[PDB]
Symmetry: C5
Subunit: 308 residues, 5 copies
């Protein structure tokens, strides 16, 4: 079946939209999120006018020519299924189908608990006799209401824009259509799960500055280092790979450095106290009591400024 003949006044501007249904899978490490949503198309063509002698008409999927719409960014062609084709008697085709696919949106965990991500879908079509203006979207058919699913994100925006980019070959003048879904993580879940316990263990380490027993100080600091490594093991099963950097990955390095400095300070204090310099050891101890929380706050503020 060939596309309907044009009037040559303008290329066939097919209206398209995608109503999200279930963006269920979020493979952060694989940078692939899997969705099973619905896509709706509406375009003008010659059909049953029924002005003389209705309500709605429905043909078969293999009868009417449907424009070939494909996603640039998928592991494989979308697992789709034609749901409802409406040949409106005023004259148009309304083709609604249900597709499921992996979308291949590269997440960016530069600021992991407080990240704002943008899922991307790129639409392309082929040209047979004339170009296509598929990017014309009514912005009314798109949108998922909500569900409290394993996706703990809050949806901010669903902008859809025409972004003509350079193709792999660029043989034709085809322009892809951009669906950008900007979402924000609900970070409250992570404050008592990844952030607060780490600070608690760090403060347990710091409680070694109010003690004079070198052996108890060593127990506190090194057992706290072990506890922090174990808690990092616990946390990193939740975190993605992140082979570049992270805000919460630099706080962990800061905490490692602070354990190192705490060990150094405890050793220095004990060396001074054994070398018969109790006054200097006490001065260093009190300075550490004041300084370690202060330096930690300063480092956290500096890291927040660097990342945010």
């Amino acid at each position: 079946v060939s596309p309907p003949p044009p009037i040559a006044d303008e290329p066939l501007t097919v209206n398209t939209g995608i109503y999200l249904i279930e963006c269920y899978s979020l493979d952060d490490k694989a940078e692939t999120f899997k969705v099973n949503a619905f896509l709706s198309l509406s375009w003008k063509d010659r059909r049953l006018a029924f002005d003389p002698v209705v309500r709605v008409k429905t043909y078969e999927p293999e009868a009417i020519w449907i424009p070939e719409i494909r996603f640039v960014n998928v592991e494989n062609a979308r697992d789709a299924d034609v749901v409802d084709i409406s040949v409106s008697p005023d004259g148009t085709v309304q083709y609604l189908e249900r597709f499921s696919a992996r979308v291949l949106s590269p997440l960016d965990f530069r600021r992991y608990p407080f990240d704002s991500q943008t899922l991307h879908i790129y639409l392309i079509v082929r040209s047979v006799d004339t170009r296509n203006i598929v990017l014309a979207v009514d912005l009314e058919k798109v949108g998922k209401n909500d569900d409290v699913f394993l996706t703990g994100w809050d949806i901010e925006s669903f902008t859809a824009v025409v972004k003509p980019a350079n193709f792999a070959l660029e043989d034709r003048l085809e322009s892809k259509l951009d669906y950008q879904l900007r979402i924000s993580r609900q970070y409250f879940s992570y404050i008592p799960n990844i952030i607060l316990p780490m600070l608690f263990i760090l403060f347990i380490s710091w409680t070694a500055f109010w003690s004079t027993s070198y052996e108890a100080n060593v127990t506190l600091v090194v057992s706290t280092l072990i506890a922090h490594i174990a808690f990092n093991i616990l946390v990193e099963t939740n975190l993605p790979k992140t082979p570049y950097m992270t805000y919460t990955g630099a706080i962990i390095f800061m905490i490692y450095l602070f354990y190192f400095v705490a060990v150094i300070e405890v050793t220095v204090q004990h060396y001074l106290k054994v070398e018969s310099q109790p006054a200097r050891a006490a001065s260093i101890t009190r300075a550490s009591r004041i300084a370690f929380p202060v330096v930690f706050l300063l480092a956290n503020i500096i890291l927040a400024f660097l990342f945010f």
Copy 2:
């Protein structure tokens, strides 16, 4: 093959049911549970009357028109197989098939050991010449007897109701059918596996309030913190992702906070006892002995009230 012609008195009300067979897979993190069950349809159509010149008749799956029934919430179209079609001589079609699919029911682990979940299946059909009343269910063909499988849930209810909701496009007046399976976790397995050992380790930590040795107190409290983090590592392999909150996830935070407060109290007691205030240190120690279990019980009751 076209649907049988109607009398125009009422739309074709096809009776449907699903008899659960094996809801074997429960991917909590993926929020997908996989089932391989049977679906039965019964509807009126013209066929062999056999009033003159039986028992049962059976046609081929590709011969009789079967209504297109699809699931709203699946990763892919159900992997089905026609099992038995019965063209009853009194006149009807009884189409029983075996399908297997992922159902995409978002679990809700707000109260993980004591959760009551509701698995959801949505049914939709297409319209060719007249609407359909598929939601008419006899409620007799549905139901799985039981099996002591890896599913440790106790089935409470299997309500099936007609829930006309807004579709993605809502071009037609199609109404989906709701299958809701309300089940409850058997929580007894978790009391001696996730709950009691954590309390045992916490009480081991608290046994540091009956001691005067600061170094032994530090050993108890910090080694117990390490043990609690290791036990949390052990537990979280069983738990799902839960990127929002949890009842058992807030008890863990409470236990972390209690370890922090225990360390603070031990340090305060040692500081007072070294600063030549044994009376105040002993008073704080006895108050802690009384208070820590009491505050833990109060916090647990408050959390239970907040979550239940």
Copy 3:
């Protein structure tokens, strides 16, 4: 192709069997074990008699009607392939095929190291003109010789019985065929891997009853608790989910309780010894030396009686 016409004396009793080849995959958590075995069918039909003017005849899989045999309990229809069809000149069809599928047998880890499981396969067929007696098995074509594979089980029995159970719809009088494979775990591998080291760590904890140093006692008991949690982490990667209970899962809880009681006893002994009651502390210590192994043996015997 239609089934061969009957004599109406008796329904077509097709003989069936399955010769196991490789039951390679055992997904205990998923409760699915994957096998790639052979199935053989033998039944009477009209064919080349060759009494006048052999040895064997072979037709094409798409030529002869083969009864539709399906498995009740599979994720998807078996990935089969026709291997050899023998139209014996005396008159019969011998259809041997190689199928691979997941079998969906729910394991039961109530007694994990010493469990005896029963893998189940259910066979069903469709009826076109007359019923079928597929359950008639010669019990001679079934059976795998052996292999020392990743399956560490010892095969006990391969009983095959006719078990007419209620179907999902029960429209026809079809009766399924039961293949039950009863196997037993070789538990010797687990005694030096899951059982003996746990007892060794527990006894290391108990060696704190032969000491008077409270701080060394705390080190022994709490570091042993940490070691036991780490060993439980090591073990549970081997174990399945078991969301209900386990014999080896209740021994772990008993060991947790014994660590708790050991900490309590050590704290009581130190409190008495500090409160100037060395005689009572020594009496409690000696009683603990005698009692802890005795109570552990009694608890283990009680648990064995409860589970076995």
Copy 4:
């Protein structure tokens, strides 16, 4: 298409071979290794003689009859693709295809770092008019050159032999063909990764025999037990399931037993030294210094003899 007619002098002896390309996947726990290799067949048939009026001829895969060659041991039928069919003018067919499949070779980790395994492939064919002698292999077309891939094995032998074994039904006289690939692990990688650090931690434990401090001895031995359990956790992610036994799995049990005996010795020494028997305690301590390395060497030699 039917097989070419025979001369009845001998059955059609088709020459076969498989040239390994990428045996990339080695799922030790699943006992399945996945390979994507090439298979070549050569057999005599009537074709273009071209003695009057060449170089080579090529037909279509669906035109020439190719013998049905299947693998006994695969999860599913090989994912193959016809690559090159050469109808040599002297008269023969040379059919080379690229197949990828899981091979289902049960590994045997009785001696894990020093194991020598034998990957197995079984070939079977069907008979239509005459038997087949497929087992006739030239042994020249087989073989992979090499690659330094994730397979850290050194290939020893590629023996291919005719092994007529009892089939599942044995209706015909078909004989399978055996491809056995004997390979050996490069064990050097494991000496500094699984073996040497464990010995280092054990010796750290033994350094408690040169000390008189019971509390420091307890710290050494029990913290070393914790370290050994953590290192076992680290190692076992690399190791397969091994539900039967292992050489490196019995060394771990020996090390657990040695930690138990070390704790027992330390407790005995402290009990004697507290009970006012310093001479006996020192004698036991020196005997332990001499004996523990000696007994460990003896146990390792005994285990090596038992396993090798």
Copy 5:
């Protein structure tokens, strides 16, 4: 459809290229990386000349003969889809398709944080009437712009060369085409995540050379060994299998050896200090203070020289 007839002057030299789109999956342990890219072909053939009585022409994928191009190194045949065929009126075919497949490039983690890898793609074609010169590449259609994806690599080179290698059978004179993509890891992410914390824990261990307390020294060194094993557990989830060797895997062994030597030195110092040799113990202690960092630097330089 047959390939277009040749002029016999030269074999059909089809120009080919692949424009990378998403090399998203990098299964280091499996040694398979999955890409969904575009491939473009351009070749001369007889078609619409349109010199008398254009712009572009497009046929159907099943109409024009397209050369059979296959990848030597894939798990399965590429999941491709024809995108755009351009029959240029000057006379040529430009066939652009989108394929997704696993590429089977064996990574080489001899120097894990600082590795430079070379992903390999091998192209082969079949011969029907004449040979092919597919290796003729314009080097202009290839190339991915960039994306900050889960791939943390920096692309260095995209060399494409003709590498005629020995085939599995080498029946024809076919020559494969080599696509080599040389990339380099961005190692900065790993310095504060795998390298610096390990050094921090090692230095914490070394702080035991500035102390005289044997029990505190044991606490430092053995608790630091536990911390290092836990951190190795944390790191190895990121690392691949590496069953041969590694630069970062030999630093870990060096650190294990240094913990062993630190324990030995502490034990020697305590033995000398107890055996009434404080001068020798102090001399060994100071020599260790100087030597351990020096020997560690020397060992690291030696390892870097050996690996780089």
